């Protein structure tokens, strides 16, 4: 394969090898993310801020879930013969 | 099992459908959501787990929790309830641009999309080493992992009535792939008469058998224990590249030195491969000067004449000898000259195709070979 | 300094594979330089078998190419000897040594101790 | 492939002498020859290298000369622990064959 | 009405000309700084707008004052006067590191330089989206011209005696380009015997009546309303490769497929162009292995053989047949291979080029063709 | 223009076309960065370090104040006919 | 005086060789390293400076020290225990992730590692300001140093069994390299019959007697006072570049005109060289509008003729006649068409040399000179 | 050297000719960073915390040290004649 | 499933412009397929008018090219037909059907309610 | 363009019997023509595509051939549901010409 | 507007070296225009010695190019003239001009006050 | 390179007549010649360039004319601030010659 020797002959030298190694995913875990907080401790402190917070992320979070909605409609149970 | 039925879709690549079948495999049944739901609701820290029988445990992450519980919650005799919302306020309003940021129209196909734990780690609250505990993310190869973002999630169920986002996070398996060797390369530069020239390789090298490729190291570790990658490195050599690696020294292209270039000697088995008509060689143990003549190009310094040699201003001790005495200029085949600018490539290339089309009457007319 | 070490079994049965050892101490096998297998008949006779380089880079001695194989571990930076179909003409002392992985300049600086197989 | 053959096989010598052995190869290997000692319960030392390159650490007594075909080393004022096994080997081309080997005893 | 006197000037270009006369339209007379100073003294909250009847509002921004009205104030009967300006002077000097990267020695020119919103977002307190509210910045597509940052602002004034800095910013209005379409094209690989090939296009393309043009989608935005982009992103495209477009496929370039490269079947009008010769098709109907022999490079596949389709462990119900059946090698004129790399490039460029050296001599014999 | 038949026998496909939409700048906004705070309620607890401060922002202050007057001096109106 | 014994070492490069030299001297003793340790212990600030009377002082920074001192212990009386050291651990998970993502496995080798003070940020604290004034690093020159990342680190020795890092930081010294000018170079836009053409050149060129270089200004910073470089900036220009700047019109290569091609005139010797055919160039001091005949590439308005122009709606007042009155097309040479495209180079690139290989025969047979 | 009067008839003109000044290093001083802070005056509050911060540390910590150690031990005193 | 619709003046003076719109449900237009508008004449006549392709390809009949025009609106999910200098010959019943994009392969597979229109 | 022509105009025929419907081109077209079925009150629908591919949910009952020039549409079998409108279109080229038209009327 | 200043002492031995001080008012000497020399000769004789552009080219009268040279000094805007082997007759009032830096457009438009070195 | 000759040297005139100055070039200089007017306490100024190119703020009494070779410089209208220096130099090509010179007396 490599001629090491002629590649000493214009400067070039190995400095390094080892084996290919790739990784693959095979288990899954849930992660959510809780985009509401616990603020019952507070005492209806934080009602025009929690309100604001709220409709912001509408904005966002609903393109997300109608395209969630559109994939998983196109999913049919196996008819096999 | 489920068939994808290819009717309501577009145009839609391998990526999307597969991405799109492995959601539903995924995907929590209503149930579970409502199960889920109630969970969260009676969630106070900021990171739990949920647990039920009929999956796994579920990891609840609140990203703005521990402000509030340490710093807000205790500190409510003495503020006002006006100051209260205000130092909450600027917190869910940076908190929101990180997910706008994140989960936003930035983010074009949210089906067929990897987000690894390190662009989630505002999200998750800031750091994620806490997060990876609780999932029972360790050992020693977790560094190499987490360094190359191996650890990676998927967008599961966006839910707008409780505003949570599920998402699958796995942990990967490391797998050696058999016959691939990745080869690291280093080079020192050479003159020729009085200007000094250099080789251009690749920086890494993959070899399998007879074929040699290129290597991405973008997305790869070089750990001690080995190199792991993310995607996959590999991509194909050009035939010309490939038979310079294999011999054919004619087929390196070769470029002029730069100012910032100090690679002008490299220790290899003992002895010191020095270029020493741009560096001043001097023999420590005899105080004579090593020259190298303008038919060398390269010098290769042993102890079997000089066993301790100065460079620049570092003096080393070098070995037996394991290399010819020289590299003669008559003796090697040097490629062609080049130039790798983006504006070099531009003007030559340029340059070239106007040469080609001035012959194109003649070129194309190709028939005094058989009329000679 | 450079110590090399064979280690493995000092009796094989026929038609069976040998696999020995070398550890080496006080230099890394992953950085520079050849790794040899040379073994001594009874009779005052060497043979060299067959070398890994530092780049993974393999080479045997063409009367044994087929039942022989050379290998490596970084780990504990060990190179190891894989004999196959081991008749009784193998019975020999075998040796572990350095070289440099360049010709003409193939000569060894560095060996074990030397371990026997008998077979 | 490259025949060796050394000679003398066996040699025997006193403290203060000098000896010479000799190693002849089939086809020209340039000047590439190395020279090994052997003694029991330690490893093998490289004396010579390329013909007549001394290795460091080495006695300056043992000296080695020819090209080519024809070669011989020379250990001048022999010692009590110069005493011992000697092998020739070709380190030019593939594949590396060694010598046959000399013996020495004190007399 | 003003001129650029254009005499105690040196060399100046366009962007600098115009940015300079359009300052004088924008900064403040004499008597609006004196009143702005004023009214910034008795500015006591961290945003703030101060109305003026002689022109529009301006809206004043102070970046650490949240920290000192939320944290500090609430403290001082508590906390000590040494530890009081410990805290602050830690805040202070973090806001001029972001000062000193922003308006620095980075900043070439103050004049011509146009900094995005998201950019000053330190600068402006932490966060914008309460900045964007009070200066009436909202509506459907404030999230996509927020995302190709086409909110700017520029320097109008600098206050060194009160030090305040004036900028002017704009919120951008969006036009539609008549005649011009941008295309995003997706594509498949195909086997040329064993070796898997593929197309080498740019993935947007721009067409303007009889124009093909490239397009660089770096500050484009793809919102579903339409494709938004701050700078005007089409810049030429070679002729080579418009007339690849175009349908030659004899100009276009082949390049192979890298180990990283699951692009193998694309669902297009209910059917499937699959690689078959590269992946595994089964038809889940019958159980029969979808083949693909040499002389075939893509297979089109239908409901009119193979109603349900498994590729890759993947089942797609397809329909009514909108392809040919396969594409034979004998009847389509492929393009040259090429390879992208930078070292490659230039391994093959001079290659070429020292080959055009070699027969200078009859490159130039223009008489060759005459004489014979 | 884009001859698509040919261009799905190569593997390419289309698989969006849309309309093009630039940016153009009409109205502008004066927006003013207030670099020092009010430090009233302190109480003298910080004048070290304001003092500090108002020196490092006038090292890179100056600079730009001198470069907008070297070009808004060169601004002269019409004096035409 | 060292040696550095190149027995135990493999394969090393002059860099790793020079750098582990100089780590002997830059090193702290085994005693040095005693009392820094003891001294360590005693230390209650975030920033300390050590006296010895060794060597120089030595500073120490601590990164998390400023929260505890300002937060967490004045609040002792009055939060729990509990709450303290969770407050506590949240700030160390974080700095603990700094220091893995600078000292982890992305920094393959620790001992050749160059380490930007700004890189070492975080680290520090969060700030460097008062790093660099307790450090005696200050002078009209830090800016600029500061800028171009100057000010490097290099790391000297680990302790892990007091859990501290040395390193050695060295403020730079400014040197000029006599001989050589960087100029910076400008252009507008020309246009041949109908098409709007641009040369392609470097926007930095490097003037050294009689040759000419390229110039990286990516470590550069242009300070009013002069060009300072952290690294070496000059590399090889291609001869054919060299000749396109030393007069040769026909080696330098031109492109067309993009879509946000703003630079259609500029301001040079008080005059105005506007393209006329791609602009309005309209003369105000009496109505008549330019035009320019597809003869001229370029005009040079001057108050010749013209004393007040407008161009693009904005009007300049130009002076003395510098230039000719135009450039004509029959009286220049110019280069050949270009595009500085990735994809549009291999699409150019694969048909020059799949052209070369249809005529390779006839190249090699070049025998008909001799011949007729 | 640059032909200024032939780059101008194709539209390139000079807008800033300066002198090239490099950066070199000559002394230098000594940078600690203290890992482990003064937790005294918390009356072990943290210990939990501080454990676990010194255990994330050594895995980071501890390839550093040896391939200091590694290449220090290449280093003789000069063993001149 | 794939639902067409087309909305438009049943009356439209002659000489004037006639506008209908076929509105998409079940499906998007700007996805795939060519999107084709046919009218059946009074006696069982089917005449082809025109296509626009997802790929805002647009063609046309070459014996009424010049008074026809066929836009798309993504947004709404709709197609539009534009016809001009409209004469007594021009009434008919209006379709809107979906073909494919690439001949020969031009068969229609769903097609709308219809509408009629009188000159 | 391409001229089809479709016969007969009118057919009579009554339920359980085979029928055959004949479109003739000017031009050969190889084997693309298509059959659609017209009902009043409800849309058109597919029958046959590409000379003899029956479309998927249509009965079985209905049989394309031919190639090039002559193209024959067979029902056997015939239901009430079968009696409505048909025509036969080419959809290989432009200009995309239908047919005549065919209508069914019990007998 | 542009004011021009040059400095310089007034009286230097034979054989020495002058040296002169033209400080720029107004402009800046780092942007645009060949910077000039020319002396006046007793008997109304002006001699053009060279200039400095702002792209730190040069060039001198061939007749003293061997013994002349024209400098700059940014942050000052300032340029400087060096003549050295002053011999006999190098007395005369020397000025400071500006010019363009291309030809054949080198005339003068600003010029200095001028200042007179005797020998 | 280019030797210019400016006649005459002496010339005196009332305020109101019109004087000329002439230059003549060993060469064709095209119409490169530049004019200054050189007054005791003040700066020399720029009157004509290119031959007859009037320097914007310059009275037009001032009027130049020539090509080639032949050239000279009219001042019409004399007035008591007309009375000083004026030069003429050749600014086509190196190196720069002026001219003689010319004083101006009031007569």
Redesign the interface.
Known sequence: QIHWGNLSKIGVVGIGSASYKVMTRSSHQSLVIKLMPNITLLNNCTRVEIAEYRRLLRTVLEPIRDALNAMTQNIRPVQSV | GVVLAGAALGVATAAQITAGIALHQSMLNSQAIDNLRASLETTNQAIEAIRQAGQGMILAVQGVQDYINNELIPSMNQLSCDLIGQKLGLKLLRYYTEILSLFGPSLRDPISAEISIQALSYALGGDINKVLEKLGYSGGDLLGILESRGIKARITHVDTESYFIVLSIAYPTLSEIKGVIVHRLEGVSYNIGSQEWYTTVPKYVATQGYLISNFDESSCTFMPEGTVCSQNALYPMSPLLQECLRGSTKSCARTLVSGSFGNRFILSQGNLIANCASILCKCYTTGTIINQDPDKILTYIAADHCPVVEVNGVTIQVGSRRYPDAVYLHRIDLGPPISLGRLDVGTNLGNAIAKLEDAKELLESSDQILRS | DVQLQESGPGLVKPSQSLSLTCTVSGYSITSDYAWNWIRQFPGNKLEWMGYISYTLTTGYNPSLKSRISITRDSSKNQFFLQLNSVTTEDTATYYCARSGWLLPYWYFDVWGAGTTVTV | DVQITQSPSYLAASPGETITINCRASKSI?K?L?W?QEKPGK??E?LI??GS?L??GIPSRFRGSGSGTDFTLTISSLEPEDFA?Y?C?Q????????G??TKLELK
């Open positions: 340039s590439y190395a090994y490893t093998n490289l290298y390329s390159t290795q460091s096994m092998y080997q380190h030019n081309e593939y594949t590396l064959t060694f046959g080997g």
